[PDB]
Amino acid sequence: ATFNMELYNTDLFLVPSPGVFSVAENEHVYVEVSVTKADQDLGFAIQTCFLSPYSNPDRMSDYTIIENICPKDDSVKFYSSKRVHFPIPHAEVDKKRFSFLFKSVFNTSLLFLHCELTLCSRKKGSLKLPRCVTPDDACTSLDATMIWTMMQNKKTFTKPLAVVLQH
Amino acid sequence: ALDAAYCFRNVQDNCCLRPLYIDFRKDLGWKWIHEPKGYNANFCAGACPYSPRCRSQDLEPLTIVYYVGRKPKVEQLSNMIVKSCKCS
């Protein structure tokens, strides 16, 4: 089971961005997280995403975009990739996609997007994992015991961002 | 009772409660607990008679602050604080 995180130019998620994704204040960032796995019963949730000046994801940051599945930033939008008659590239790959609006909060030309995923079970009883919870369900209710359970099986990803100033 | 009142006065090699502060981010890697920064979890250790082991007996919960989206949540996480030990 392999996982990847990629940034795209637009909300069409057609063209993965070459090099270091470059962004300015009030521009959007388009994020796709993916997993190539054999077990159909295996899923994942986007647990937490944040931006930091530090390459180390253990470093604390106050620019939090998603916190425990539910988005914290008001600009977050989720996109479907599992829509009938709406094909996406690479079928063998299961994906979750979202976007956010970049806000000027740091004073650096280089930032890191850090996202952690947690594993989940798509079908009852098959896997030793909690059931998958959508962002909408988590916002209405999600408790500490479930969060602790999800955190037991998690993978973190990091991509750099080049921050440009503009008039 | 192999609790703090006995064990912290009679410091010894046999099975007893041991004091231990844990910092969530620094010691456990639990980044999602906003408050407290840490707490006294303690642990159980020491020799036992006769093949038994020194292990926890009474455990207590810990009140934590975490977030879901922008919603602050306060809850009592069970099984966080070791209060007494037993040979088993």
Author numbering:
A (entry chain A): 15 to 181
B (entry chain B): 1 to 50, 75 to 112
Paper text:
In spite of being a monomer and lacking the heel helix, mmTGF-β2 is much more soluble than TGF-β dimers and retains binding to BGZP-C25. This approach yielded high-quality orthorhombic crystals, enabling determination of the structure of the mmTGF-β2:BGZP-C complex at 1.9 Å resolution using X-ray crystallography. The BGZP-C binding site on TGF-β lies on the inner surface of the fingers of TGF-β2, involving residues L28, I33, V61, L86, I88, I92, K97, E99, and L101. The tips of the fingers of the ligand are also engaged and form contacts with residues located on the CC’- (P71, D72) and C’D-loop (N82, K86, D88), as well as the C’ strand (E81), with N82 being vital as assessed by Surface Plasmon Resonance (SPR). In contrast, in the structure of the mmTGF-β2:BGZP-C complex, the FG loop undergoes a disorder-to-order transition and forms a helix that also packs against the inner surface of fingers I-II and III-IV of mmTGF-β2. Hydrophobic residues A158, I161, W162, and M165 form crucial interactions with the concave surface of the growth factor fingers, including W30, W32, V92 and L101 and mutations within this region severely disrupted binding. The structure of the mmTGF-β2:BGZP-C complex shows that BGZP-C not only binds and engages the two critical basic residues on the tips of fingertips where TGFBR2 binds, but also occupies the underside of the fingers where TGFBR1 binds. For the BGZP-C domain, the key residues suggested by the mmTGF-β:BGZP-C structure, such as N82 and I161, were shown to be essential for binding, though most of the hydrophilic interactions occur between the side chain of one of the partners and the backbone of the other.
